[PDB]
Design a binder for this molecule. Structure first.
Ligand code: NA
Length: 330
């Protein structure tokens, strides 16, 4: 089997992407944030504290003939941005882009933090990291990909995120029409539960490539590219008037600037992030200070190849017995 679903930016900045997901019988369609940096499929629901719901579509298990309470199971998760959610668990039928899993754990939120409530466009998360990170207790649950894997034509999924445009998540096949040149595959460590890999270096604009190992994670649920402070300083030094602002919480730059590209290495291959991808717009409405899309990972304890990086590539998440990542230009 295969599946193929379109993923759509939630706003004009590509702050996140949402993908429609069918849950239950008859189908309830929720727009979920597919997150290769976490491993829980959780949804706003009929159980979510009413004051914490503001415009999201909810899953109502009582209206699904295939829903069943997973008795005694609870979940609670905290993300890198400080947000959190928790609740209880149902199993139900879940379909993505025509690919169906029966008996998928659907984590129903009883509580969500303010940033979830405030984002009316995201109805929950669908985690695509390794199932070792799933938070369900006392019986850890599998991700949608892990449950689908054995049925897929190939044990893979791909992320093809758009810049200011829709893109695609495919399950079970490589769309050889969706990228240019060849796919370069690179090793993955699953030891922290992430799609963790090592980039071979970077370049800023038309500058020379710096060969250096940068360990980090491929994380579709993170908006920005978080790299070591040395790398980030070298990038922003090429932008007149850019500076790190402790008050704003990262590098800012004049909205009048033209940003340089940023290149990262995948083995001997190179992915180029156009400068425009690094512009996250005014820090507050009407400001002439703009927020940068490349930020320091210092204090986060890991480098994160978030959407700024991934949307410059066609990315293969290869879930074979020994997982690997693949990157192609597009
Ligand atoms: Na922000």
């Amino acid at each position: 089997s295969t599946g193929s679903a379109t993923t759509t930016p939630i706003d004009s900045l590509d702050d996140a992407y949402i993908t429609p997901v069918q849950i239950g019988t008859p189908a309830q369609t929720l727009n979920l944030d597919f997150d290769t940096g976490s491993s829980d499929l959780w949804v706003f629901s009929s159980e979510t504290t009413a004051s914490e719901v503001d415009g999201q579509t909810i899953y109502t298990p009582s209206k699904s003939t295939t829903a069943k309470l997973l008795s005694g199971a609870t979940w609670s998760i905290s993300y890198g941005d400080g947000s959190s959610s928790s609740g209880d668990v149902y199993t139900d039928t879940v379909s993505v882009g025509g690919l169906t899993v029966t008996g998928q754990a659907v984590e129903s939120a009883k509580k969500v933090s303010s940033s979830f409530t405030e984002d009316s466009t995201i109805d929950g998360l669908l985690g695509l990291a390794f199932s070792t990170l799933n938070t369900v207790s006392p019986t850890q649950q599998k991700t949608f990909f892990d449950n689908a894997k054995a049925s897929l034509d190939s044990p893979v999924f791909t992320a093809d995120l758009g810049y200011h445009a829709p893109g695609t998540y495919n399950f079970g096949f490589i769309d050889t029409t969706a990228y240019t040149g060849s796919i370069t595959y690179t090793a993955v460590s699953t030891k922290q539960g992430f799609w963790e890999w090592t980039s071979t270096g970077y370049a800023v604009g038309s500058g020379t490539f710096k060969s250096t190992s940068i360990d980090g994670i491929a994380d579709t649920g993170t908006t920005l590219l978080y790299l070591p402070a040395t790398v980030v300083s070298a990038y922003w030094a090429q932008v007149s008037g850019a500076k790190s602002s402790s008050s704003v919480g990262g590098y800012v730059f004049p909205c009048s600037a033209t940003l340089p590209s940023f290149t990262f290495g995948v083995g001997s291959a190179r992915i180029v992030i156009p400068g425009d991808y690094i512009d996250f717009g005014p820090i507050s409405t009407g400001s002439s200070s703009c927020f940068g899309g490349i930020q320091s990972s210092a204090g986060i304890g890991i480098n994160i190849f978030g959407d700024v990086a991934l949307k410059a590539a066609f990315v293969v998440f290869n879930g074979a017995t020994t997982p690997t990542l693949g990157f192609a230009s597009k």
